[PDB]
Design an enzyme around this catalytic site. Sequence first.
Site, PDB file in Angstrom:
ATOM      1  N   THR A   1      -3.432 -10.578  11.907  1.00  0.00           N
ATOM      2  CA  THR A   1      -2.045 -10.563  12.538  1.00  0.00           C
ATOM      3  C   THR A   1      -1.631  -9.301  13.121  1.00  0.00           C
ATOM      4  O   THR A   1      -0.508  -9.164  13.205  1.00  0.00           O
ATOM      5  CB  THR A   1      -0.905 -11.036  11.407  1.00  0.00           C
TER       6      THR A   1
ATOM      7  N   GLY B   1       2.070  -0.163   9.786  1.00  0.00           N
ATOM      8  CA  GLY B   1       1.535   1.256  10.031  1.00  0.00           C
ATOM      9  C   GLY B   1       2.508   2.225   9.045  1.00  0.00           C
ATOM     10  O   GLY B   1       1.866   3.191   8.808  1.00  0.00           O
TER      11      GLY B   1
ATOM     12  N   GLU C   1      -3.333   3.878 -19.892  1.00  0.00           N
ATOM     13  CA  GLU C   1      -4.376   3.480 -20.452  1.00  0.00           C
ATOM     14  C   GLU C   1      -5.155   2.479 -19.866  1.00  0.00           C
ATOM     15  O   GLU C   1      -6.139   1.608 -20.044  1.00  0.00           O
ATOM     16  CB  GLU C   1      -4.671   3.613 -21.963  1.00  0.00           C
TER      17      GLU C   1
END
Lengths: 426, 201, 150, 22, 428
Positions: free
Chosen positions: E170, E135, E245
């Site tokens: 999970t 979260g 790059e």
Amino acid sequence: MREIVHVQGGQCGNQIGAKFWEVISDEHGIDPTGTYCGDSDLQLERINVFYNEATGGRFVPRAILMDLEPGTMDSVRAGPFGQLFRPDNFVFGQTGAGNNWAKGHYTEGAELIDSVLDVVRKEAEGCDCLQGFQITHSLGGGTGSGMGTLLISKVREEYPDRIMETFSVFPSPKVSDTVVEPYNATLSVHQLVENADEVQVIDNEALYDICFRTLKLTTPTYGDLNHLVSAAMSGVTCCLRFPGQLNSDLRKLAVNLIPFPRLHFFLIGFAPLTSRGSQQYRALSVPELTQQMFDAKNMMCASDPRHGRYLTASAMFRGRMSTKEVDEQMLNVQNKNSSYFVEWIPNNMKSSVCDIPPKGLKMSVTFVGNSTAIQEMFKRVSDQFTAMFRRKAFLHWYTGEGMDEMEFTEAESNMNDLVSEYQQYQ
Amino acid sequence: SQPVFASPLNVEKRRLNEERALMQAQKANIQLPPNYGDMDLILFPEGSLKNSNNTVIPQSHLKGKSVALYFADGADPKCASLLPFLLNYYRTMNEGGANQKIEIIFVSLDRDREAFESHRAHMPWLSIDLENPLTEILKRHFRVMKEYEVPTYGYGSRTGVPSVIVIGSDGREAQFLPICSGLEEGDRALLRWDWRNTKFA
Amino acid sequence: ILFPEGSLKNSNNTVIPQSHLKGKSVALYFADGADPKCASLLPFLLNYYRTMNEGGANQKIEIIFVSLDRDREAFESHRAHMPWLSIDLENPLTEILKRHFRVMKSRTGVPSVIVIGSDGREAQFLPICSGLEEGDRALLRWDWRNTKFA
Amino acid sequence: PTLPFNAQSCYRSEYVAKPLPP
Amino acid sequence: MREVISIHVGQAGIQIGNACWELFCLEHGIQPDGQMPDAFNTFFSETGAGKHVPRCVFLDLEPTVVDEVRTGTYRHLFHPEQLISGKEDAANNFARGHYTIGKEIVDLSLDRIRKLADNCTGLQGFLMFNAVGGGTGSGLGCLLLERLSVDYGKKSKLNFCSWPSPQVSTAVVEPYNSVLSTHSLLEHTDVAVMLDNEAIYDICRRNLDIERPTYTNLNRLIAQVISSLTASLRFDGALNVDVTEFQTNLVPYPRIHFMLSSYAPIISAEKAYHEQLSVAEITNSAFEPASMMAKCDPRHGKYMACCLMYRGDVVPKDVNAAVATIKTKRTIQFVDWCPTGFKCGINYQPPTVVPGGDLAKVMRAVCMISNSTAIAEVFSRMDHKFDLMYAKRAFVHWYVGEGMEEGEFSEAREDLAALEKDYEEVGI
């Protein structure tokens, strides 16, 4: 040469001064008995600025201690560096101005001025030519706020061509000592603006904030907090004592700060302020000294500087530091923090490079600044005065001792006017 | 009496030289006491310097090379930082020619024998043994100290450990390399070395 | 010097100095007679020792055994299993090493083969009884090529 | 009561007894 | 000096970071006490003489793991105010971090970055480390990455994500947390290295032959990848490539910037003893469906861009021949409009190694990062897992009750649907 006479008034002043003389004594390396050891010409060449030789090697400080009750004058006597002061320098009142400005000033104080002026001029005329005075008082109490401001008015008229700087503790936002707070403060501000050149404001609670956060000390006593004012109040006067590249003086910063005579109320900040934990993990340089010294949670007055714009500000750097690294950064902050300063002053800032760092520490700065952020602080004292005057509360404790109701009406008018100029100059 | 007056090398120097001066003056127009210019001393005695092969070399071996003393401590972090760069400088600068250019003497501010030998194992230049009095005499001569332990006579610390001092024949401080000084070019001050005009004559 | 002149004995109970160990990987084997785990780990270790010495022209590995047995009667009886060196139970050295490497009859216990470097300096734990718990198979992860006593 | 302070001014540091031109 | 700044958000990135800065201390030879007994300037500052301080920031809403870093090994090498700790964890809620509880840390965080970024010019980029599923990593990761985009509009910022696997998740709210993440982690970020966890589970069991690993082995193996990624910023070589790059080479269009990783060799002391890792075969193991770290077969996708940092001793003979071999392979199909696909990088410094870890010292390593269309179903798989749960409003009221609105969930629907639509549009 140049002499600075110390006067300590009130309970707060006498406590705060006893810690100050400790900081100066060991900055110069003086045994509390008064003798000299420490082996340096450069810490010693300017010693007459505060002390007087007395033929046993010893130095007695040019300090006078005054109070209307003998309670706290034995406190400094019995405590640290009590042997140093002169017994003749003590002046006692046996009665005590019980937080009453009236008896601090008119009635009770008048019969003790005839003694306190005796010792002050006895020390004054002994030298060649005096330079200034410094006075420590709190503007809450009676024997500091009223008994102090009379001594301000008397020595000013005697010697009008000298200067004085008063380190003054004001009221607080939230917590409130001395419930007759706004009476003693307002009556003293309208006298202090008329007779004194420079006033360093101190609040307990920006000062309580610092030791809670930065120092990380859970239960902070008077001793450790006064040690934090005493270092700043030693820092502002380094340059008189020690040489440097860009020298300074009280009068040097007196003229450089104040534009107009009635606004001379200054903020203090000090840096570095490092706890035990973070002491070995900082690489102290001129960059982060400036970033520490411009921090809202760093100044010792409980005013958020982000409300107002800084009018004039001075920086007394202390130690061996390179000077573009000095000057270019004050340019940096003045350009970067464009909204924080005032447009109608080119080069808002001021600098000074005092060549001797504090003892043990390596690179220090002491920030003094005439802000306009004291718009909110004096309007705080103002409305507290208005709240306790219309009800006419606690007026009897003053009026009965030669006070006048006309004095309070002038005091508010003469202090609402001081608010006027701060707001006017944005 | 350069760079200081009150140093053990200089007190020995003065004693020896004017002993000789008085003797030959009496034996003979000669100015007493002799000028510091006119005095002559042997800086490193017979058994001081010892190299990478653990062999003692005389002082006359150092002729024609820019010599520098290196005051080092084994356990000081600054010295631990400065060591690789000084070694690399020694490497490149002496490799890049068909002539020996600079030489380093090791002077130990270290605590004891074990740590001294452990630290000396890393260095490819000359050293002076720690029990040899010349180490303490050189420390007092060039006013390097980690802490106010030995009294200084109104002087200060010239520097702190670590330090590199380009020296001359007579104990002259030819130049100070600003490692930890007023300038603070850590690891970079080694390029300030003017090896051409400071040869150990 | 990790071991004074008499803490080490060979299979025929004769003392050897420190210097003899050099050139080859050496490990301390913390064990005791009574334990089921030691009884189960001993033969795998024996086979590993035999093969790691047989496959080549050098000696590659060597084991010094540290006893946590109750007393002497168990000590010879569990020393006679072993074709490698052992530390006597009556030397103080056992208690110092015991406490130092933290096997206890607290983080670690019996059995524990731990490979030993130059001076102290354990290289790897050989996870025989640990979080990994490679029973009789951690043994193979020994790095004799890296660690050589010197 | 102090053990001694041993930082030195820049003026004292560097304007020293130079070897003289003749 | 030229530099790069590191950001760790949440329990995932924090202990990844624990594995991260352990190596970098060992790479530079600095002990955990903090002192050694210009190349490191891109990751470590200087404190006086001899003391080096990490240039990273830690950020988590709960002190249960932040305290664990402080009282651990790095008590003195780290900095106390370098670590930011809140009061309450977001607890598997996008709404808790991004809306309510996160605001009290962003003002504290912004101050820290600004104080770290201003001093020296020539900064290169940022490095996020978070779990998409967690979260705080999703929530407080977003608003910090949103705010940085507005302030330093000029600037590159890399992302490292731990995407939810097709079996192991999970957490029950992983489909909600992820689809909400990528709507607000498509636009704000530049490049996001996708990783799965069960991919590396089968990595540990097949090549590195350990039958059950834990987190301290996962983070030890991701630390080798990121060290092989960014060594070019630290040390020199024959050919090095930095942050700025990667996006030039790998991102053809602004939406398609989710890519995989693979590292060769992944070999213990079991087999580092037993064979060469020659250039002709370490690149073959790199293209193997085993070695990729994002749990999807590239057989059912089309490769479009690849980037190959060989680190260690490789002579250019072996590069060119190995490259040519890969084109000839018919199993690996490029997209027809992109003739070139490979941007080689050879470094000269040997591969680094943890001590007493499962990594064996190898004389050459390859870290391959690959923009492919095989991501197409990995996005649609999570879209399908969203569709079930959204169908009757499960676990919505947690998000709604915190301060979110129903309807921004819908906005993420056509956002992820557009993302799957783009890949099938591009890859034809």
